[PDB]
Design an enzyme around this catalytic site. Structure first.
Site, short mmCIF file in Angstrom:
data_model
loop_
_atom_site.label_atom_id
_atom_site.label_comp_id
_atom_site.label_asym_id
_atom_site.label_seq_id
_atom_site.Cartn_x
_atom_site.Cartn_y
_atom_site.Cartn_z
N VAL B 25 9.00 7.54 37.64
CA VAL B 25 7.85 7.64 36.72
C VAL B 25 8.14 7.23 35.28
CG1 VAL B 25 6.68 9.39 38.11
CG2 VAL B 25 8.22 10.14 36.16
N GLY B 26 9.41 7.21 34.93
CA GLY B 26 9.83 7.01 33.56
C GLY B 26 10.51 8.18 32.84
N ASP B 53 21.00 13.19 36.50
CA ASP B 53 20.68 12.46 37.72
C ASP B 53 22.01 11.90 38.23
OD1 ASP B 53 19.97 10.60 39.64
OD2 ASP B 53 18.33 9.71 38.45
N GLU B 200 -1.28 8.53 39.77
CA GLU B 200 -1.44 8.24 41.19
C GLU B 200 -1.37 9.58 41.97
OE1 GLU B 200 0.83 4.85 42.85
OE2 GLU B 200 0.79 3.84 40.87
N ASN B 227 2.58 8.01 32.18
CA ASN B 227 3.21 6.74 31.85
C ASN B 227 2.64 5.57 32.68
OD1 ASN B 227 5.04 5.01 30.57
ND2 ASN B 227 6.67 5.46 32.06
N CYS B 269 4.12 -1.62 29.90
CA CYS B 269 4.47 -2.76 29.08
C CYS B 269 4.67 -4.02 29.91
CB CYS B 269 5.71 -2.47 28.24
SG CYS B 269 5.38 -1.27 26.90
N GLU B 272 10.30 -4.63 31.45
CA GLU B 272 11.02 -3.35 31.50
C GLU B 272 11.38 -3.00 30.06
OE1 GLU B 272 14.84 -6.09 32.49
OE2 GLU B 272 14.27 -4.59 33.98
N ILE B 273 11.71 -1.75 29.80
CA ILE B 273 11.95 -1.31 28.44
C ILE B 273 13.42 -0.96 28.28
CG2 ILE B 273 11.26 0.33 26.65
CD1 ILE B 273 8.67 0.80 28.30
N1 LIG Z 1 5.72 2.10 30.31
C1 LIG Z 1 6.59 1.27 30.95
N2 LIG Z 1 6.34 -0.10 30.91
C2 LIG Z 1 7.19 -0.90 31.56
N3 LIG Z 1 8.26 -0.60 32.29
C3 LIG Z 1 8.51 0.76 32.33
C4 LIG Z 1 7.72 1.80 31.69
N4 LIG Z 1 8.26 3.09 31.93
C5 LIG Z 1 9.35 2.86 32.70
N5 LIG Z 1 9.53 1.47 32.96
C6 LIG Z 1 10.41 0.79 33.86
O1 LIG Z 1 10.10 1.39 35.15
C7 LIG Z 1 11.30 1.64 35.91
C8 LIG Z 1 11.50 3.15 36.13
O2 LIG Z 1 11.62 3.83 34.87
P1 LIG Z 1 12.81 4.94 34.81
O3 LIG Z 1 12.80 5.47 33.34
O4 LIG Z 1 14.09 4.51 35.37
O5 LIG Z 1 12.32 6.19 35.63
P2 LIG Z 1 12.86 7.56 36.21
O6 LIG Z 1 14.04 7.73 35.18
O7 LIG Z 1 11.84 8.58 36.27
O8 LIG Z 1 13.58 7.15 37.55
C9 LIG Z 1 12.47 1.06 35.06
O9 LIG Z 1 12.70 -0.28 35.48
C10 LIG Z 1 11.93 1.05 33.62
O10 LIG Z 1 12.45 0.03 32.80
N1 LIG Z 2 3.52 -1.92 47.36
C1 LIG Z 2 2.76 -0.90 46.84
N2 LIG Z 2 1.52 -1.16 46.30
C2 LIG Z 2 0.85 -0.13 45.72
N3 LIG Z 2 1.23 1.15 45.57
C3 LIG Z 2 2.46 1.38 46.12
C4 LIG Z 2 3.32 0.42 46.76
N4 LIG Z 2 4.52 1.00 47.20
C5 LIG Z 2 4.42 2.29 46.83
N5 LIG Z 2 3.19 2.57 46.20
C6 LIG Z 2 2.74 3.72 45.50
O1 LIG Z 2 3.79 3.86 44.53
C7 LIG Z 2 4.07 5.25 44.29
C8 LIG Z 2 5.54 5.58 44.67
O2 LIG Z 2 5.77 5.31 46.05
P1 LIG Z 2 6.62 6.40 46.89
O3 LIG Z 2 6.58 5.91 48.36
O4 LIG Z 2 6.24 7.79 46.63
O5 LIG Z 2 8.14 6.20 46.46
P2 LIG Z 2 9.58 6.95 46.55
O6 LIG Z 2 9.37 7.74 47.90
O7 LIG Z 2 10.70 6.04 46.56
O8 LIG Z 2 9.47 8.09 45.46
C9 LIG Z 2 3.12 6.07 45.20
O9 LIG Z 2 1.96 6.45 44.47
C10 LIG Z 2 2.78 5.05 46.32
O10 LIG Z 2 1.53 5.30 46.88
F1 ALF Z 3 13.76 8.98 39.20
AL1 ALF Z 3 14.98 7.81 38.68
F2 ALF Z 3 16.25 6.67 38.26
F3 ALF Z 3 14.47 6.73 39.97
F4 ALF Z 3 15.46 8.86 37.34
MG LIG Z 4 16.03 8.14 35.57
#
Ligand SMILES: Nc1ncnc2c1ncn2[C@@H]1O[C@H](COP(=O)(O)OP(=O)(O)O)[C@@H](O)[C@H]1O
Ligand SMILES: Nc1ncnc2c1ncn2[C@@H]1O[C@H](COP(=O)(O)OP(=O)(O)O)[C@@H](O)[C@H]1O
Ligand code: ALF
Ligand SMILES: [Mg+2]
Ligand code: ALF
Ligand SMILES: [Mg+2]
Ligand SMILES: [Zn+2]
Lengths: 284, 304
Positions: B25-26, B53, B200, B227, B269, B272-273
């Site tokens: 999610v970010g 993590d 979502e 986000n 955005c 990626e950031i």
């Molecule tokens: N607002 C945003 N716009 C564009 N890319 C984003 C945004 N927020 C996160 N990302 C990108 O989405 C992906 C997942 O974000 P991440 O911070 O790693 O999530 P989490 O830490 O919850 O696993 C990464 O590739 C990151 O660069």
């Molecule tokens: N190709 C896709 N197109 C649109 N939504 C998608 C796609 N793949 C996954 N999703 C949506 O993206 C979000 C993350 O998918 P999810 O299966 O929960 O991932 P993970 O199990 O790795 O956390 C969910 O809201 C899911 O419905």
């Molecule tokens: F939830 Al992540 F890297 F996928 F912090």
């Molecule tokens: Mg992370």
């Protein structure tokens, strides 16, 4: 090496299929999809989809309530899901249990116990694991080695034999395989490469990579595709010898058997924008 | 309740800040952003971003290498990152035990225990206790929901197992450190949990369940970052319009449900950031709320 999972979906030997990778990449969506494709494709066989993510999403994905006891997916004859709640499970075993259901690691322990009980008891021909994100799933896959060395009476010997048996099955490429899921972005690509290296070192078979949420290109979509393409090129170099399956971002979330089934077809015969482009929009 | 984190970013009481939520999610992006906003506006305090993590991404996000030992973020005087390395810690513990116990005797502690599920939460918790025993503020970049819940239950879980305990000294001291951490994490002035989500179904309902869990642990949560938002009615793509319709549906539910929370809306955005510059740019919208009419251009302003 074919850009789809048709070989796995019709496999006659695979008993354990792990679906893993970074958070939010589509592990649950993909493992539901693989499980649906296998069940449709092998009507004779019985399939279990088990979530080993402690924050379960199978119930959310299908829109029906699953639990520690396997239940058939409504609409399927041969596909079942399971979401183990550790405190519920423990509370039953005990008949402090509840404190234990809160200890870090208890989730993996109970998931492993579920695997052992399918070993001991030998119900389902094939089990598909919708795993937790990367880091904790590596701990789960190490459990057979871990328990082995720690153990290293007749019931302790029984525990010992069963974990050796799992260790052997998990490391048999005909019985066990790991499907990686990723997005074409830096954080995901690098995490996935680290994961694959680790799995190879565990002697676990990994031969497939689902690249999900691809745009295949609105200025925002054009820039984001340019980025995805750059990492997709890298994925092609890196994973030449793997089945790499490229899946599109759809116009809405993917939930319910209907929509999941509709998305899952593209793991079997790969998505083609020429012929399949309209499908992305049926998910709104 | 202002739609931003300005109260938190300028807080002078907070010692522990958790940033969590569903996978992808970010969290890491947001926790880096929160930490940068805090470091910049409190130059006289010192900040530590720690990733709990086990699949670490803080080095990936800034594009430089962190490890078991804290190091400054290049370009910040004020902010440091750490990525806890379980096997490494166990290895040093084993080395020091030998060089000045069955698990330790054969030098295999790390081998025997470095891979036990739960070990990451155990070491992350040891790390916490150390900052207790002797950085002004620590922001945690947490693992996804399920395992982070286990982490947060830990002090309160240890307190109760230990209660039933009834080198014994180490156990005594652990019991004491557990109690003060447990004390501090339930203090709404010293610690708070910032939830992150996407608009979502799966993320929303996971977040709702997470927040209900935290409240029962007496952990303070008054903030949600939503986000990856498209804001498609600003400017004018079929896919984006349909996806925005989905997102807006869940946003209306979030605004209702979390009326008394700071709900902070962040844009998807155009890339990626990554890197101090892009994270800093993205982070201004945690402090002052994003306005798609006026701020829209920012999503295309990321450096390579
Ligand atoms: N607002 C945003 N716009 C564009 N890319 C984003 C945004 N927020 C996160 N990302 C990108 O989405 C992906 C997942 O974000 P991440 O911070 O790693 O999530 P989490 O830490 O919850 O696993 C990464 O590739 C990151 O660069
Ligand atoms: N190709 C896709 N197109 C649109 N939504 C998608 C796609 N793949 C996954 N999703 C949506 O993206 C979000 C993350 O998918 P999810 O299966 O929960 O991932 P993970 O199990 O790795 O956390 C969910 O809201 C899911 O419905
Ligand atoms: F939830 Al992540 F890297 F996928 F912090
Ligand atoms: Mg992370
Ligand atoms: F966020 Al997930 F499986 F639900 F990585
Ligand atoms: Mg999932
Ligand atoms: Zn678009």
């Amino acid at each position: 090496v074919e850009p789809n999972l048709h070989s796995l979906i019709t496999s006659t030997t695979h008993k354990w299929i792990f679906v893993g990778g970074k958070g939010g990449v589509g592990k649950t969506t993909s493992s539901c999809s693989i499980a649906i494709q296998m069940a449709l494709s092998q009507p004779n066989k019985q399939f279990l989809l088990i979530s080993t993510d402690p924050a379960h999403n199978l119930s959310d994905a299908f829109g029906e309530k699953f639990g520690k006891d396997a239940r058939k997916v409504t609409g399927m004859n041969n596909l079942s899901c399971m979401e183990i709640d550790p405190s519920a499970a423990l509370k039953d075993m005990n008949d402090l249990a509840d404190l234990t259901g809160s200890i870090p690691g208890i989730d993996e322990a109970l998931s492993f116990m579920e695997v052992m009980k399918h070993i001991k008891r030998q119900t389902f021909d094939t089990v598909i694991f919708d795993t937790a994100p990367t880091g904790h799933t590596l701990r789960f896959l190490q459990l057979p080695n871990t328990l082995s060395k720690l153990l290293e009476s007749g019931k302790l010997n029984e525990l010992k034999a069963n974990v050796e048996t799992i260790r052997q099955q998990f490391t048999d490429p005909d019985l066990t395989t790991f499907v990686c899921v990723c997005i074409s972005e830096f954080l995901s690509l690098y995490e996935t490469e680290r994961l694959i290296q680790e799995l190879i070192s565990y002697d676990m078979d990994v031969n497939s990579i689902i690249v999900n949420q691809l745009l295949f290109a609105c200025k925002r979509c054009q820039a984001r595709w340019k980025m995805q393409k750059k990492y997709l090129d890298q994925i092609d170099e890196l994973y030449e010898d793997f089945h790499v399956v490229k899946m599109p971002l759809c116009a809405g979330e993917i939930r319910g058997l209907n929509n999941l089934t509709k998305f899952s077809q593209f793991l079997n015969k790969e998505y083609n924008p020429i012929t399949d482009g309209k499908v992305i929009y049926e998910l709104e």
